[PDB]
Amino acid sequence: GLNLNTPAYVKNAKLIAWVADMVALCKPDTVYWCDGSDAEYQRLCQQLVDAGTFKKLNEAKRPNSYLACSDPSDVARVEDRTYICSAKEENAGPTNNWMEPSEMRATLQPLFDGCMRGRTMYVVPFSMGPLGSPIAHIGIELSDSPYVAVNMKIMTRMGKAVFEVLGTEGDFVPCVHTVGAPLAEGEQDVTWPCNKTKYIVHYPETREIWSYGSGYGGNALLGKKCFALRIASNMGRDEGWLAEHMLILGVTNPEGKKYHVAAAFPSACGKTNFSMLVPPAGFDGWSVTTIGDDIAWIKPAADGKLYAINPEAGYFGVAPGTNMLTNPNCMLSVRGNTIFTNVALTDDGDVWWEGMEQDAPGKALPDHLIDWQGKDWTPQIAKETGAKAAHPNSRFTVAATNNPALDSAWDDPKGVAIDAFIFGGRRSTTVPLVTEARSWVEGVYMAATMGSETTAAATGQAGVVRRDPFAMLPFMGYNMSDYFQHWLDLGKKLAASGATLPKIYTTNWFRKGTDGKFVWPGYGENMRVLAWMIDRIEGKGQGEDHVTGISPSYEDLNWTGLDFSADQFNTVTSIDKAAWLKELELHAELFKQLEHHLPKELGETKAEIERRLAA
Numbered sequence: 339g340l341n342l343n344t345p346a347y348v349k350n351a352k353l354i355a356w357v358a359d360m361v362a363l364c365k366p367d368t369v370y371w372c373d374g375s376d377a378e379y380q381r382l383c384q385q386l387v388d389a390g391t392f393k394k395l396n397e398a399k400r401p402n403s404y405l406a407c408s409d410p411s412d413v414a415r416v417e418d419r420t421y422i423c424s425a426k427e428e429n430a431g432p433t434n435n436w437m438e439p440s441e442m443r444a445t446l447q448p449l450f451d452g453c454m455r456g457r458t459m460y461v462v463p464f465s466m467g468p469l470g471s472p473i474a475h476i477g478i479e480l481s482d483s484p485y486v487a488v489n490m491k492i493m494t495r496m497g498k499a500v501f502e503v504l505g506t507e508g509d510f511v512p513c514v515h516t517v518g519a520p521l522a523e524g525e526q527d528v529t530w531p532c533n534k535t536k537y538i539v540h541y542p543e544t545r546e547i548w549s550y551g552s553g554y555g556g557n558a559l560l561g562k563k564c565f566a567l568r569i570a571s572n573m574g575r576d577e578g579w580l581a582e583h584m585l586i587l588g589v590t591n592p593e594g595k596k597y598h599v600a601a602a603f604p605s606a607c608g609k610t611n612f613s614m615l616v617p618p619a620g621f622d623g624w625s626v627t628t629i630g631d632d633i634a635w636i637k638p639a640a641d642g643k644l645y646a647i648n649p650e651a652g653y654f655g656v657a658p659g660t661n662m663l664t665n666p667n668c669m670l671s672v673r674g675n676t677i678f679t680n681v682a683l684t685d686d687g688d689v690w691w692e693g694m695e696q697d698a699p700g701k702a703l704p705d706h707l708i709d710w711q712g713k714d715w716t717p718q719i720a721k722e723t724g725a726k727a728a729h730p731n732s733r734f735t736v737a738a739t740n741n742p743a744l745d746s747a748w749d750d751p752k753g754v755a756i757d758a759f760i761f762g763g764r765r766s767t768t769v770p771l772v773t774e775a776r777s778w779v780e781g782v783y784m785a786a787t788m789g790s791e792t793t794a795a796a797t798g799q800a801g802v803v804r805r806d807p808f809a810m811l812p813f814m815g816y817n818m819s820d821y822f823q824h825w826l827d828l829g830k831k832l833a834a835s836g837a838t839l840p841k842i843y844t845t846n847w848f849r850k851g852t853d854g855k856f857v858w859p860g861y862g863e864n865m866r867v868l869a870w871m872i873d874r875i876e877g878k879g880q881g882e883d884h885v886t887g888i889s890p891s892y893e894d895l896n897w898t899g900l901d902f903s904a905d906q907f908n909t910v911t912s913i914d915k916a917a918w919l920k921e922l923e924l925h926a927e928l929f930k931q932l933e934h935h936l937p938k939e940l941g942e943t944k945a946e947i948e949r950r951l952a953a
């Protein structure tokens with residue numbers, strides 16, 4: 339068998355045997371074990387620069403940073419090619435793509451057979467959660483992409499320290515990734531190898547993850563969505579914990595009281611910006627700190643509280659829109675040591691994306707850029723054709739420790755107690771700015787039925803409203819109706835301790851006016867909504883009862899520093915009967931599709947809302 343070049347510190351025979359089997363299938367030219375060091379990261383980056391995948395950015399403008407641009411077919415998640423191959427189709431459910439496991443194995447085996455000819459297999463060891471902690475899980479990703487390897491260094495705890503935890507007998511999550519572009523002897527490679535044919539396949543009974551054809555982070559960083567949401571949610575269902583598509587933030591008010599909240603918004607619908615927001619004018623003495631921006635693992639304790647940890651080590655965030663007004667903590671985070679993907683290149687060797695002009699002299703566009711497709715770009719081109727310099731789903735990858743607002747407990751394996759949950763989709767109509775659920779069951783109803791307009795984070799037509807329960811439509815690892823029951827059962831467990839349950843809120847930053855612009859300013863001004871939630875948590879905030887829950891009056895929010903009138907507030911908080919009647923019919927369609935194992939409590943809650951609308 340091919341020489342594995344196994345390091346001496348790898349003491350795990352079952353792991354080595356699995357690598358041997360995967361090398362025999364994928365047939366790479368050579369095998370490299372990533373140790374996760376800083377020196378190795380620099381060498382792999384230089385390798386990417388030599389291949390043309392990376393351009394090194396100007397050291398004076400953007401220290402130790404790189405720019406990659408991808409094939410236009412490989413810019414986002416591909417939901418139609420993502421599968422949960424559970425033993426029974428009913429354990430995948432209507433929200434997932436299913437295929438009989440033996441039939442998927444026969445589909446993928448010829449694809450992976452020889453997939454890495456002409457390439458190096460990188461062995462990427464990683465821990466999700468702090469290394470060696472009771473809540474952490476170890477994975478091994480085999481990849482033929484050094485781009486995956488360097489991004490995994492930032493997004494996970496990667497490298498040789500993992501094998502100390504694994505030891506001789508520890509188990510691991512097996513992850514296989516190929517760009518699906520084997521190379522003949524003497525064949526010229528492309529700068530972004532990929533395949534038009536893609537599969538991202540999960541086998542829950544074995545915890546196997548197979549990814550073919552994509553180098554895009556959401557499809558190829560297999561610890562992130564594939565393990566820490568899809569596989570982990572199935573483990574949590576069996577073991578009494580949750581894996582959620584949620585940010586976690588800490589907020590401290592001027593009296594020094596600190597609270598933590600977890601918020602589920604769909605991909606590209608505001609989590610990163612909320613998780614590190616800066617309190618605006620009017621909020622002297624408040625502070626917001628970031629635990630995580632994307633994935634949360636949550637379990638109840640005997641004290642009746644819910645404890646959350648962020649299993650990731652970095653941010654893989656949407657770049658367009660980011661500037662010093664919308665997200666200054668992010669702007670400071672990506673000052674250096676960052677990987678940018680599909681943004682534009684300036685004449686001085688820096689990066690640019692739509693939105694950065696708001697910090698520019700005269701708030702003007704740059705005179706010339708090279709766009710993410712390598713084409714010349716100018717403001718005249720932008721004005722005449724609308725060409726985007728940066729792709730709408732362009733990304734930065736940066737270590738969490740670069741964030742000035744990083745919470746001191748961001749990597750504490752004891753977790754933080756969650757005082758409130760927030761759910762919210764991208765909705766141009768119908769949904770008010772903020773609503774508090776009257777009960778846990780009503781809150782689960784709000785999360786189960788939320789809708790959101792599709793975004794550039796996945797392929798397909800953007801701007802289309804769809805149901806996205808708990809912001810987990812692309813990431814739920816088992817039947818969505820059993821997941822609803824899991825949340826209902828968890829609340830009952832918490833209540834039996836005598837505790838007061840965390841409140842559940844719906845939010846909507848994204849109501850549009852007649853010209854299609856946003857009526858609510860959002861970004862830092864979302865602090866004004868968060869401050870109301872804190873008041874409610876403390877039992878000091880007022881609210882008015884309406885059809886879907888409790889909402890603040892104008893006078894219940896702090897408007898110091900923001901010119902936003904009572905009339906503008908009425909627009910984004912009014913409950914419109916006709917719009918909610920239509921919305922409830924869309925809930926009925928979801929419940930029809932999810933009839934199997936649908937908790938009866940959801941139909942009962944829907945019937946009460948219908949009464950309140952006909953009252």
Ligand SMILES: Nc1nc2c(ncn2[C@@H]2O[C@H](COP(=O)(O)OP(=O)(O)O)[C@@H](O)[C@H]2O)c(=O)[nH]1
Pocket residue numbers: 603604605606607608609610611612631655656657658659660664847848856859860861864
């Ligand atoms: N209008 C508006 N846009 C926002 C807000 N928060 C984020 N965005 C934009 O929505 C896109 C995705 O935001 P991000 O925070 O990265 O969302 P995430 O993918 O859920 O982490 C970016 O273009 C942001 O500039 C907001 O409160 N209002």
Ligand SMILES: [Mg+2]
Pocket residue numbers: 606609610631632654655656
């Ligand atoms: Mg994000």
Ligand SMILES: [Mn+2]
Pocket residue numbers: 583604605632
């Ligand atoms: Mn996400």
